[PDB]
């Protein structure tokens, strides 16, 4: 193989003294050289009114290193955002288990 | 013809899917003892295997029922099988086989 | 004027139609539904009772609202011209089902996923409501969620998703639920893993499902491999064995064999010595309760393919049968004979066939089992009120006496007042009942021996799918002790039903009752058939066309899908079948006890039914959602 | 975006084909988490 991506392969066959023949056409993949690894750049928490300045909180994300990248290859960056349900303490009063003296 | 068959004028099978006929069909033939019959036509693919067909019916007076599997066998006489790996590393010797 | 009685389902489901049976034992009556403090009024109905109609009120109404967001109750009241009777019942939220179908079973990155959702109600009929669907990755955090409505579609929802190119691997889940009741969810699983399609299939099978520990031939298995289009195969196979304990696997390295497969047939044999030496347990009897499994690999003569097949769960036992008491009433019958129904199965769970049972205490009291592996027996009572213990033992011939299964069961008495002690049980051969056949309910009866010439009639009800299907009334003339009900079995009775009957006697106040559980054959009420309308000349050829013929009921929709048979070799779990539908609908009934409780309140409240009387002779209440255990 | 109570615990992802500086701001009230992951092909210079 010489180039990455999808490639097509054809094979043909014919039979002597009879009118029968066949042909197949399939495809395969070609991928670069090396190994695949992921690098964690930044993990941050968001909590306005306690870490920022008057509600608005601003951050900054430095660029990644990518020191030993394979030549002629493309990287990919993903940003994941999530919320944490923090349903807290101070629940109801004492349950109805020992409310039989009322 | 007058020339022994060389390899210039033969078409090649190309379609190799894994699941097809994702259609929906309705029955409105006039009844005959409560059984309606519909006729449909299908064009087979270009694989040599055994296809399995399953159908599910859901009316308004009886409810929901599931049919039984049906099997269709596609077969030839002289043919070619090709086995390929999933992925190949660039710039490396690779061997493939044809049967 | 003497009494007025109301029969009601135990739990009523919102947005449906329910019934009450009113029995005055020429009066207008009215029924009304109020909330619990008092939310205005829900509904009310008016009816009249006619002496020519035996004073039976089959009052039906539809239960509605949006305020119904723990568990809650509702009060139903009824005034019969002058006197009022009321009762409080529970309200639930489960209001239908959801079925999910996917075209394939295993995918690759970059492909697409296509699935369908079917919505049905309690009676298994199309409905239209709002649903929500989530897709969950292996860890558990949802990736994509969506909301949909299925109005004006007769109840089929198609959808689609597209797997990315750079995605995780393993097991992914689809979870769907109604918008109204988020407490109940329905789920489906699929796999994501790169692969390449195989070319032939391999089957491994033993000769006996069990494994008697006293055999000198060990365990023998056979190997059969075949191409996809029907022709035979040749090659070589490697086989290995193992031992499975509760979440544990041990591999025996000494048991690895190579065999040539010609025409798709291979034989493997394992001896006692290797099995004994593999473990550190010279005592054979310590091995009972641990299972075996075998693994095989097949290679071709051209060095082109590699297929693996595994069979797991060969039990190790000393008795080739098993006894059960899952469907036998627990409270016996003082004086009158007591009927038992045994259940015999193979060790793998498959029902047995043509094996005799008996009782060690008595003699010649024996029978056989039909295709369901159920045998019917009867036994007399002392009739002292001391509880009795019964034992059952298999009496199969041509087998040694030391290899017979047996077990024991206990019964409890019935607490009547004044010794009326009247029961019900059908004296017909418990066979494979079929829709369209007939049943003969035989009232085996024993009234009080002194003045049994006062009772005029009985009342009986049929319960199915948690609703009152039918209520009857059969009479008799004084001096009789056996009457028959020629029931006509229709298609709506599938898959099982419960018959409950009772009568009232003048003392003080007397009411006596009993119940029976019966099952029918399971199959879809409709009929769908798919076949080849072609002339069926020879095998087709790629690129050709053919004709497909369908037969089904008028005015229905048929959905289709075709899948290659090589995918099922890789992963063949979590498919769709009618047995699954019946299992799901059956597992969510109300009354879980077979029947014949401790007293009238017990028998009435053990079948999901509520009885209220104008004289205060009512039944207890329940406020949970599932029966214990 | 807008994070509410009902839609919580729903992973929200965005993609990029190049590495440059960012700027993210948050307003309102609550807690949340943000992560950045860069993945690429490396050089690892045989059965």
Swiss-Prot record, chain B:
Please, which domain of life does this record's source organism belong to?
Eukaryota
The identity of this protein, by name, is Complement C3c alpha' chain fragment 1
Query: What residues of the intact protein does this structure contain?
Result: 752 to 850 of 1663
